[PDB]
Ligand binder design. Structure first.
Ligand SMILES: C[C@@H]1C[C@@H]([C@H](O)CC2CC(=O)NC(=O)C2)C(=O)[C@@H](C)C1
Ligand SMILES: [Mg+2]
Ligand SMILES: [Mg+2]
Ligand SMILES: [Mg+2]
Ligand SMILES: [Mg+2]
Ligand SMILES: [Mg+2]
Ligand SMILES: [Mg+2]
Ligand SMILES: [Mg+2]
Ligand SMILES: [Mg+2]
Ligand SMILES: [Mg+2]
Ligand SMILES: [Mg+2]
Ligand SMILES: [Mg+2]
Ligand SMILES: [Mg+2]
Ligand SMILES: [Mg+2]
Ligand SMILES: [Mg+2]
Ligand SMILES: [Mg+2]
Ligand SMILES: [Mg+2]
Ligand SMILES: [Mg+2]
Ligand SMILES: [Mg+2]
Ligand SMILES: [Mg+2]
Ligand SMILES: [Mg+2]
Ligand SMILES: [Mg+2]
Ligand SMILES: [Mg+2]
Ligand SMILES: [Mg+2]
Ligand SMILES: [Mg+2]
Ligand SMILES: [Mg+2]
Ligand SMILES: [Mg+2]
Ligand SMILES: [Mg+2]
Ligand SMILES: [Mg+2]
Ligand SMILES: [Mg+2]
Ligand SMILES: [Mg+2]
Ligand SMILES: [Mg+2]
Ligand SMILES: [Mg+2]
Ligand SMILES: [Mg+2]
Ligand SMILES: [Mg+2]
Ligand SMILES: [Mg+2]
Ligand SMILES: [Mg+2]
Ligand SMILES: [Mg+2]
Ligand SMILES: [Mg+2]
Ligand SMILES: [Mg+2]
Ligand SMILES: [Mg+2]
Ligand SMILES: [Mg+2]
Ligand SMILES: [Mg+2]
Ligand SMILES: [Mg+2]
Ligand SMILES: [Mg+2]
Ligand SMILES: [Mg+2]
Lengths: 51, 205, 100
RNA sequence: GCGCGACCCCAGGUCAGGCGGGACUACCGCUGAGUUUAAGCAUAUAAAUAAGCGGAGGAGAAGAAACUUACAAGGAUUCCCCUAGUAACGGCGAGCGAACCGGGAGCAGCCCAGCUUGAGAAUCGGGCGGCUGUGCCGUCCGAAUUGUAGUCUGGAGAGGCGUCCUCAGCGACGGACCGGGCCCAAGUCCCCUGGAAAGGGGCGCCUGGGAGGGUGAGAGCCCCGUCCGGCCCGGACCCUGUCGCCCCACGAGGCGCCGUCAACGAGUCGGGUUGUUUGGGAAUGCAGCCCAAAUCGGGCGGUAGACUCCGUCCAAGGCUAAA
RNA sequence: UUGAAACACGGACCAAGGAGUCUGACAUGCGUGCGAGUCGACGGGUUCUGAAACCUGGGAUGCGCAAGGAAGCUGACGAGCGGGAGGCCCUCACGGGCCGCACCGCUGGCCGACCCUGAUCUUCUGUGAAGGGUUCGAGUUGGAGCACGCCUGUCGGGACCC
RNA sequence: AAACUUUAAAUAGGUAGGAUGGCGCGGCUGCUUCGGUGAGCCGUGCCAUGGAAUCGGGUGCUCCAAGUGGGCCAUUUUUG
RNA sequence: CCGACUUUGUGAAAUGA
RNA sequence: GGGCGGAAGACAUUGUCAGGUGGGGAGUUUGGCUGGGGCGGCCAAUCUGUUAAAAGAUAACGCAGGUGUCCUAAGAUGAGC
RNA sequence: AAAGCGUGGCCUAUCGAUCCUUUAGAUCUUCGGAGUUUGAAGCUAGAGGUGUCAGAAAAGUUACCACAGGGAUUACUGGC
């Protein structure tokens, strides 16, 4: 038979975010990279990088 | 229904799932239109990509009467008074609209000004190689023509916000503008009875 | 016609813009009757004759009962606007027949 | 006992041709339900749908206002956004529901019939023959005067005038899009486990190629490929790019002057009534029946009506890409 | 089911499949962005792994910023009291004073419906100094909203499954 | 004497038990009175040992929403 | 079943206008 | 003699409206309470007294009854009795 | 005479929503191109009625019967 509530193409595949909220998010993505401690905590091997 | 809510009004009683329109081909629409524009430009090299020219006109409809926008074509009267024949304006990239009417010198002269500027900055290649006839342009002029892109004449939509400072005259202060505004509402309301009373003066008096 | 008053309310309200007088267009003469077509329509009028309601309207006018002539013309033609002018044209055709 | 011309109509296995059927995504036309909702149900809703019957193309349909607006007005068609779940409509109940304005996508206008060769059918077809072969030419027969061609389409136009301004083709080489093929970097170097090394360890290399697949297990380097492009072949081409020879006119068009002409689509519009349809409400469309036009004229301005004024357009014929 | 061990129904056993989901409108609660604005959602430009991302327009697109009327139409002339968090002053402190957000209660003003009212001024039916109201508003004297996300609820959709 | 009552219980009902109170002074009124006469309000200054017992943080204010809307037994009053 | 309009033309008298 | 021969004849008849008939046919409805339901009754609106247990609320197809009206006076009031 | 009484009957029952039609009123508003001028819709307050009385427009039969259900509910048994 069918499945219960068969999936349909008109689910909400794409979601919207406020353009200013994308800009806020990308600014706070940049601002976190300028920190060696969080770049390290995110997993990258930074022990000979100069500055 | 149940607890306090706005009363439902869903139009979901027909077979709407047979007519749901999903937009997943939207990016491909954009890409297809872009290829279409690119190849139209390549075919119409070196004509301007914006296509033919358009008039400054006013919008209709009290909501928008104060906002200018682009029209469909210059009326026969503009094309005649600019020295740009009827049959030939679409030939040299000027639309023609046989249906419009001009009621104001201001609009007519504004559209003449657009025509004159366009004819100042238009360059036209000869129909043949060496035969330069009237309306063409010089070889050295033709050698520097490119495909101008975007809106080569932007239409300012509404008049600029200028807020200057002037004297407050007493002949300006004394003006009772609200009373003014009510008085011609009276004039409009009473225009029926006043002209009836008047016409009967001719009938009997 | 003459420009607006310039004040947003009232008799002939709106914004003042200098008015322009529009040169005549074709279809400003649209239907202006012409010599030859009046000829053509005259001749076939005489060759063909009159319809029965046209004849009855002639009779009502040659009696003089113009209200009844209008009323039957309306019941045939359909609208007051056409009934009145068909009555007017049959008054024309009846004066031009008593003229001689 | 005649020969005839036309008209209508026959039969022709006459010469040459065109039609039927098929697939269903989308498109056009007719037809057309009900379960359901309305907590019953009878109008309404389901639905101007499903089913039924037909027609095409690669898109189809629509399309150059007998349009909207009341503005400072706009200006063909189509689709998206908003208008708007709004005006409206509805046992004013459940419910139903568009449009103008504006923003975008794309933009393109055209051609007939009429009054207009009458010193002259200038038009078209078929047979036959010739060639330069999607045609063109010579000749015969025929269609057609119950009108083929030409000018004109309301933005006009026909005339008369005018200094004036605008008109022809053919080659050549390409460019562009389309298809197809051929080729294209680097370890299979040493040790172990293992049926197998594609695994572990060492030493190396490619990388505009670490997409992917194959191969006896986690393969960039064994194979096909992938990146960069290169080379050859063949199509359609009729889009445009540059070169050469041929030089465009008394004809057409444009521009300007004129005032005299200035023809525009009929059982069609319009009206009544009836059924359906619609958001369309004294009736939105459509259809039947009956009534039945006009040329100082006709249709609209979303409340039926008479009058005065105003704005607006010109139907009843046709074609038309793109979105 | 008021009451099941029931002389109430289903159930022999195992394996796998099997039932509140997805969508449009709304609502409260919460988070985030900005905040009298907020949305870039339909388009355009760009994008060398990209149906992604990024930029752009809006000067009026939606919602909000203003409501009352059926419609013509008119459209907020600037708030006091009681109680109160917390801050500050006096006292050695107990106790007192002042300023007093939010919120609750109270009494009013202003705009509009409806009624009432009329000095003046004007284009003679308009304006409206003054004064109003046991009535009415989903008002005002507090700008608080726009967008996205999520849970619950509602309603239409097959709509928890049979 | 359920559809009669003079009389008339018990249990159960309501309200009050202060800081949301009073008194002085000087003001408003378009109400009220013969009238500062009252009624109320307004500003200010004074008082008011917390005004019976016991107990104790509160639905105090609001939002969204679930399930439920078949009841049954007992002591006592009680209708067929 | 029935009336009116329609296909539906031609002309004659009698009563009504 | 340009009639194939008759009969009816602009009536029948076709088309469209209009009225009557039309279970031949279609669609649908056919209330609730109730000591099962049906019939009965209205205990569905609604009044007074009682049940109703000395505030209020309080049920049953409990009891005894009422109502769907009547009135320019049988309303207002003043005087007199 | 006046105090006062009087917004129906001495008090407790005697009655009616939406849509529609109709009526009363302002010297009211709209018919959205501007007017004159009938019609139409409005605004406020009534009436025409739903007695199943918070208000569908509505007769039977089925033994030929069908379905979803019910011990919320009868006829047999048992129980009080
Ligand atoms: C004779 C009339 C009948 C009745 C009304 O017309 C019935 C309507 C009312 C309704 O609910 N919607 C309808 O379609 C029916 C009414 O008003 C009464 C006073 C009297
Ligand atoms: Mg399957
Ligand atoms: Mg359905
Ligand atoms: Mg139903
Ligand atoms: Mg149901
Ligand atoms: Mg049913
Ligand atoms: Mg519909
Ligand atoms: Mg079908
Ligand atoms: Mg087409
Ligand atoms: Mg909205
Ligand atoms: Mg190895
Ligand atoms: Mg592999
Ligand atoms: Mg290789
Ligand atoms: Mg290779
Ligand atoms: Mg149909
Ligand atoms: Mg109709
Ligand atoms: Mg009809
Ligand atoms: Mg076409
Ligand atoms: Mg039981
Ligand atoms: Mg047992
Ligand atoms: Mg059993
Ligand atoms: Mg069972
Ligand atoms: Mg079993
Ligand atoms: Mg499982
Ligand atoms: Mg905005
Ligand atoms: Mg305060
Ligand atoms: Mg408050
Ligand atoms: Mg649901
Ligand atoms: Mg006693
Ligand atoms: Mg008691
Ligand atoms: Mg007591
Ligand atoms: Mg039947
Ligand atoms: Mg049935
Ligand atoms: Mg029953
Ligand atoms: Mg019984
Ligand atoms: Mg009831
Ligand atoms: Mg009691
Ligand atoms: Mg007395
Ligand atoms: Mg009184
Ligand atoms: Mg009495
Ligand atoms: Mg009414
Ligand atoms: Mg109008
Ligand atoms: Mg009533
Ligand atoms: Mg039976
Ligand atoms: Mg039998
Ligand atoms: Mg039982």
């Amino acid at each position: 038979g069918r499945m219960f509530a068969p999936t349909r193409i008109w689910r909400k595949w794409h979601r919207r975010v406020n353009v200013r909220l994308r800009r806020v998010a990308v600014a706070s993505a940049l601002a976190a990279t300028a920190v060696p401690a969080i770049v390290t905590a995110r997993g990258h091997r930074i022990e000979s990088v100069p500055e | 229904v149940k607890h306090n809510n706005v009363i439902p009004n869903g139009h979901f009683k027909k077979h709407w799932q047979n007519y749901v329109k999903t937009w997943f081909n939207q990016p491909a629409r954009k890409q297809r239109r872009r290829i279409a524009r690119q190849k139209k430009a390549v075919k119409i090299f070196p004509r301007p990509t914006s296509g033919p020219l358009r008039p400054i006109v006013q919008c209709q409809t009290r909501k928008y009467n104060m906002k200018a926008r682009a029209g469909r074509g210059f009326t026969l009267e503009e094309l005649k008074s600019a020295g740009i024949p009827k049959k030939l304006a679409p030939t040299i990239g000027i639309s023609v609209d046989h249906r419009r009417k001009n009621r104001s010198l201001e609009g007519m002269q504004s559209n003449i000004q657009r025509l004159k500027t366009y004819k100042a900055k238009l360059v036209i290649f000869p129909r043949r190689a060496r035969k330069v006839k009237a309306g063409d342009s010089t070889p050295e002029e033709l050698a520097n023509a490119t495909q101008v892109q975007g809106d080569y004449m932007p239409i300012a939509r509404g008049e600029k916000r200028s807020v200057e400072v002037v004297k407050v005259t007493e002949e300006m202060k004394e003006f009772k503008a609200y009373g003014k505004l009510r008085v011609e509402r009276m004039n409009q309301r009473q225009l029926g009875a006043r002209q009836k009373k008047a016409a009967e003066a001719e009938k009997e008096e | 016609s003459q420009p607006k008053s310039g004040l947003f309310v009232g008799i002939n309200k709106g914004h003042v813009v200098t008015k322009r007088e529009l040169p005549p267009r074709p279809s400003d003469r649209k239907g202006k009757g012409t010599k030859r077509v009046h000829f053509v329509r005259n001749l076939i009028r005489e060759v063909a004759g009159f319809a029965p309601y046209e004849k009855r309207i002639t009779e009502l006018l040659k009696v003089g009962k113009d209200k009844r002539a209008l009323k039957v013309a309306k019941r045939k033609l359909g609208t007051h606007k056409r009934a009145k002018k068909k009555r007017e044209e049959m008054s024309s055709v009846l004066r031009k027949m008593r003229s001689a």
